[PDB]
Design a protein around this nucleic acid. Structure first.
Lengths: 163, 136, 44, 247, 23, 214
RNA sequence: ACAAUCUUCUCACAUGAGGUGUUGAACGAAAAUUUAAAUUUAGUUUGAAAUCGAU
């Protein structure tokens, strides 16, 4: 059946090769699991108790409201959108906002893969804002790859009434 | 006919034999011409390789084009038949085995010259020095 | 330009006060023996 | 005197300096103290080098060639805080513009553009002797070939006096990397150097070349010529016994 | 099963490194 | 007599930093269009190991007089102040005088000058050069090769995002720069619409413009 | 299985010797050499850029 172009985007997801390369980078900046965060904090509690400067955390940013506001501030370098969100109403505007703010973005396959990155069951969207200087040159590669396999590719197919 | 192809932005270390094997996995290559320096033999990462079948090249190009391999986007573009030439097919599927030119010059320098050869080697060196003096 | 006209707060540049609160009450539980310490955890 | 039982210096240097000055022929925003470098071409009867060596020779000279205003970048082993603290303690802030650890330098900056930017961000590049061999890697032709030969400064002691002496020695010594050839070119200084200073610097370089560079010393040397960046290579000295040595 | 190109380049770089390491 | 350099807005800040680096051992004074800019640049330069005196301090008039007086006896140094900051003050013997932002009183600028003078102008605001023709004031141009201009921009914006107070100074200075530019009189010479906001934001240390209400 | 061993220093007595590893393409100055091509090599450009040129 005929489909609006606002929903037709989510059928033309990211390719197999590039999506793996996104996740390979993301896996370096997974958020700390609640377990070791308890262990990491208790190390500082013990240091405070007996007797006594850190650095900024570097991870991926997740959550629908969190990610939208990072885009609306143009703090997001890369947005990744799960193609099979339960009520599709949740991210049908995200490609529009991500194009409006000039934030490169890609519609990746499955939401459980993104959830595993953030130690959650399901992650509806992820955003990469800050990356350590070691991988700064690496990130610019995928942004070009997304710009080549999602923006150069499709583009016109993003506007056609799907189905 | 032959599937002339000329990929771009080939990642470093993509050996021509390795590239041919990877390409042959998708489809056999009629020509496997690889770029190299005139003397150094250093490849320019130009995969000007002609496939066995023109249609096979198109199918291979569609998958290979814009593939992020080793951090570089595989800009695989099928070379047009008009663009492909006999000189382009010249040197295809051949290794650019470079002899040790640096050692050859060193060996030639180390090569002994007889008294007559040394005089022949000198030749007009005094005249050249006189010519240099005349220029000065 | 962004949309957030509001000025950037102090939280995003200072060490987190969420853990600094959690750290303090963890020192509470360490001092009074409520929770086993890290060195106690290893030997236990 | 040691080269060919004669010292045709000074007068040759003065004549070259006069010729360079004679051959003279907005800029406020493009003003610099750059001067015409003095390049000396030395001819030997045998191959001085057999393989490329990416290590400049610390040819100490009385008159330094590198301007003191040049920013010096030091590459030292981890941790960087210890090396940075010693640099601050020694007061080499105006000399040591930035010190980059070996692990940090190789990892943080890897791209050709980033390496090129870092290469042009420092006028003088210096490397610690502990990790001097790694300089050819993580730099590539963007440094090794683009006129960036790190100075092998010995800073393993981690002493302020040792660092100051090494920094002063590096500033006062010319740089020249040995490569496989029977000939070599050495930068003897700039046009601003005095004729006597240029002659003294040339003699020290020639003495150093015959000592630690030329396998046969003065005997293997065939001819010596000196010139500017565009001047003619006037032959400072030629071996008179080279005819018998060649045979 | 099909083989990805980057798999072979890994082998190529290993061969170059091994020759240097054994040199 | 008036010297001008055709410099783009993005490279405007970078060029001046290089200019101060080359002439560190000379007496230089830079005029900009904002007191907030004066605070920002002075804080920024002193934070990148470039000690610079300024006419802002803690917004204390006594400090401004003391700083101005100290610069008078000092044969070398770099000072920052606005057009109104030096409006009426006696200009001492200074080797280098520079107007960073376009003056809000062009007819007072020509009267004030009447060392050597420098103009920092965008490539899209050359109408001021034609204004000098109508002013019957001689002029000259100074060229600069962009290769030797230091690209510390990679480290600059990174420090701004990392630091808080430095960031707040930049945005307030950026907002004051845009408002002062919007408050200009010679609209046929300096137009806010013609100037590219993205390039201006790059000069302040921002990769992206901050969201300032007009 | 886009994962692998490119050394974060050694030996001899503050001194000597040693560490064998470098993207590609394009632009370009004049030198010393070796038996016309070959070695070194000023000074630059660049998205780890690329569409024949292999000697």
């Amino acid at each position: 059946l005929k489909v609006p172009p606002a929903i037709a985007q989510f059928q033309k997801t990211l390719d197999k090769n590039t999506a793996t390369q996104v996740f390979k980078l993301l896996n370096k900046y997974r958020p700390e699991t609640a377990a070791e965060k308890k262990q990491r904090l208790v190390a500082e509690a013990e240091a405070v108790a007996n007797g006594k400067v850190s650095k900024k955390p570097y991870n991926v940013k997740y959550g629908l409201n969190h990610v939208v506001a990072l885009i609306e501030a143009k703090k997001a370098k890369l947005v990744l959108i799960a193609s099979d969100v339960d009520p599709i109403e949740l991210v049908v505007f995200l490609p529009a906002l991500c194009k409006k703010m000039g934030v490169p973005y890609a519609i990746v396959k499955n939401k459980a893969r993104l959830g595993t990155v953030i130690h959650q069951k399901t992650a509806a969207v992820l955003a990469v804002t800050e990356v350590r200087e070691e991988d700064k040159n690496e990130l610019a590669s995928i942004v070009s790859a997304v710009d080549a396999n999602f923006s150069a590719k499709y583009d016109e197919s993003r506007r056609k009434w799907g189905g | 006919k032959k599937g002339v192809l000329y990929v771009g932005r080939l990642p470093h270390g993509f050996y021509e034999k390795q590239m041919r094997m990877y390409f042959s996995q998708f489809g056999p290559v009629l020509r496997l011409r690889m770029s190299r320096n005139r003397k150094t033999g250093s490849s320019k990462h130009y995969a000007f390789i002609e496939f066995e079948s023109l249609d096979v090249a198109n199918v291979v190009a569609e998958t290979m084009h814009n593939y992020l391999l080793y951090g570089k986007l595989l800009q695989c573009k099928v070379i047009p038949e008009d663009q492909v030439h006999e000189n382009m097919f010249k040197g295809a599927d051949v290794p650019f085995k470079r002899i040790p030119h640096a050692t050859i010059a060193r060996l030639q320098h180390e090569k002994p010259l007889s008294k007559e050869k040394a005089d022949k080697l000198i030749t007009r060196h005094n005249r050249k020095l006189k010519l240099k003096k005349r220029k000065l | 330009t962004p949309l957030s006209s509001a000025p950037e707060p102090k939280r995003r540049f200072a060490p987190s006060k969420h853990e600094q609160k959690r750290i303090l009450q963890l020192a509470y539980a360490i001092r009074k023996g409520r929770i086993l310490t890290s060195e106690q955890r290893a030997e236990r | 005197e040691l080269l060919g039982s004669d010292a045709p210096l000074e007068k040759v240097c003065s004549a070259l300096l006069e010729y360079e000055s004679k051959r003279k022929s907005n800029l406020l925003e493009d003003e610099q103290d750059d001067i015409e470098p003095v390049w000396l071409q030395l001819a030997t009867l045998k191959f001085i080098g057999n393989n490329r060596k990416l290590i400049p020779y610390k040819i100490a000279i009385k008159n330094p060639v590198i301007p003191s205003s040049s920013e010096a970048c030091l590459i030292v082993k981890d941790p960087q805080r210890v090396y940075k603290d010693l640099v601050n303690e020694a007061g080499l802030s105006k000399v040591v513009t930035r010190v980059i650890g070996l692990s940090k330098l190789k990892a943080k900056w890897n791209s050709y553009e980033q390496k090129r930017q870092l290469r042009d961000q420092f006028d003088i590049f210096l490397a610690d002797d502990r990790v001097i061999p790694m300089l050819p890697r993580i730099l590539g032709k963007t440094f090794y070939q683009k006129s960036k030969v790190p100075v092998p400064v010995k800073i393993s002691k981690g002493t302020a006096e040792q660092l100051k002496r090494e920094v002063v020695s590096a500033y006062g010594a010319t740089y020249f990397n040995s490569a496989p050839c029977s000939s070599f070119m050495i930068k003897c200084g700039h046009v601003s150097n005095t004729s006597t200073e240029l002659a003294e610097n040339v003699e020290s370089i020639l003495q150093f070349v015959s000592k630690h560079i030329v396998p046969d010393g003065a005997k293997g040397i065939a001819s010596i010529h000196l010139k500017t960046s565009q001047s003619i290579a006037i032959p400072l000295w030629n071996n008179p016994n080279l005819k018998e040595l060649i045979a | 099963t099909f083989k990805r190109a980057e798999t072979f380049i890994n082998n190529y770089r290993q061969r170059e490194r091994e020759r240097i390491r054994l040199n | 007599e008036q010297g001008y350099v055709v410099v783009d807005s993005d490279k405007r800040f970078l060029l001046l930093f290089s200019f101060l680096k080359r002439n560190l051992k000379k007496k230089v004074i830079v005029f900009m269009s904002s007191c907030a800019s004066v605070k920002y640049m002075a804080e920024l330069l002193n934070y990148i190991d470039l000690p610079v005196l300024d006419l802002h301090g803690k917004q204390k008039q006594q400090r401004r007089t003391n700083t101005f007086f100290e610069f008078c006896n000092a044969e070398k140094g770099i000072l920052l102040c606005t057009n109104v900051a030096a409006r009426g003050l006696d200009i001492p013997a200074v080797d280098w005088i520079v107007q960073y932002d376009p003056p809000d009183d062009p007819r007072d600028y020509i009267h004030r000058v009447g060392g050597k003078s420098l103009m920092f102008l965008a490539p899209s605001e050359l109408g001021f050069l034609r204004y000098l023709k109508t002013a019957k004031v001689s002029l000259n141009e100074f060229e600069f090769p962009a290769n030797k201009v230091a690209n510390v921009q990679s480290q600059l914006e990174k420090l701004v995002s990392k630091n808080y107070y430095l960031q707040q100074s930049a945005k307030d200075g950026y907002r004051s720069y845009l408002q002062a530019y919007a408050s200009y009189s010679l609209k046929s010479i300096f137009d806010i619409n013609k100037l590219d906001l993205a390039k201006v934001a790059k000069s302040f240390g921002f990769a992206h413009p901050p969201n300032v209400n007009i």
